[PDB]
Amino acid sequence: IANQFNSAIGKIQDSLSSTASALGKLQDVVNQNAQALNTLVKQLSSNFGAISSVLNDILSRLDPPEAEVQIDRLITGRLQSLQTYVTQQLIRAAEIRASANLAATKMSECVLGQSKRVDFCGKGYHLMSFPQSAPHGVVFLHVTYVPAQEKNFTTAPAICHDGKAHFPREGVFVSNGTHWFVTQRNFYEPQIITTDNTFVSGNCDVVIGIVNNTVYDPLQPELDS
Amino acid sequence: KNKCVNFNFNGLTGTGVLTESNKKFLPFQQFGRDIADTTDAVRDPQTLEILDITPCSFGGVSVITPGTNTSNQVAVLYQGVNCTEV
C-alpha cells in the first residue's frame, strides 16, 4: 500500500504537469469574465442609433435641443449594455455559488471525515482525501479502494450440520471445490467454518440451496483436553 | 506631462496622464488603440514622440466607522489608488 500510494501521487504530478487541460474547468471562469469585460467595453464604440459614439462630437455639432435627442440614444443603449452585463453576472454567480456549496460539502464528507456515499468522493470505496489550493477554485485528491483481481468460486446460502441451518455472521460462504470456507466480500481470506463465524437460525428444510458440511466447534477439543 | 490634464491633439481629445513610453509608431501612424479600440497612446503632431495615456486616478471612497452608539470616528479608504488628495 506504501508503493501503490506513492506511485499514485507521482502520477498526479506528471498528469498535472504534462496535461494543462485538466484545469480547464477553472480556465473557463477566467475566459467567461474576459469576454464579458471585453464585450462591455467594446459596446462604448457602438452608435446605438446615434450619429456618433463620441459624446463631445455630438455636443460640438448639433444644437442643444438636437444634441439631447442623439445623446439620449447613447444613454439608452449604453444603459441596456449594463443591464445585459449585470444580468449575466448574477446568473453566472449562481453557478459559482452552487459549485462552492458542493466544494464545502465534499471537504466535510470527503476530506475531514470518511464518506459512505456512492461515488461522491470519486470511484471506489473512499478512504481519505487531500485538499489542494487552486486559483479561483480548489482541487481534491481522493484516495479510494478499488478491487483489482477476482476469481470465480462456488457459494452456498447456508450450511447444514446438525439439522439447523447455519448463516454467516460476516462475509460469505465459498468453496474451492472441496471444503467450504468463509471469506469477506472485498477480499479473499479463507476462514474455517465455525460456530463463532456462523449463526444458528431455522432448520435445513427452509433455505433454498442449502448444502451439508461439517461446522467445527472449538469447544470440542477444549472439553476433551 | 506627468500630470492629469485635458489634452486635444489634432482631431482627438481626452483626459489623462501623458508619459513617454517605449512604443514605436510607424512613420504614418499618428495614434494607437487598445484591444477595446480605445486610444492608449498618441504621437505629438508637432515633434516626434510617443506618449502613453494613463487615466487620471479614480476609485471608490469607502468609509470605515463603528456603530453610531460606539463612536463617530471614521476612516476613509480610497480604492484602487495610492495616497494623493489627502
Binding site: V41, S133, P135 | -
Partner: peptide, 22 residues
C-alpha cells in the same frame, strides 16, 4: 492557470497565501 473606462477590479479578501494556509 492564468480597464480605463471605469471598470474596477476589487482585491480578494483573503490572499493566495492565506488560502494555502487553510
Amino acid at each position: 492557470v492564468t480597464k480605463f473606462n471605469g471598470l474596477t477590479v476589487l482585491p480578494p479578501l483573503l490572499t493566495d497565501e492565506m488560502i494555502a494556509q487553510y
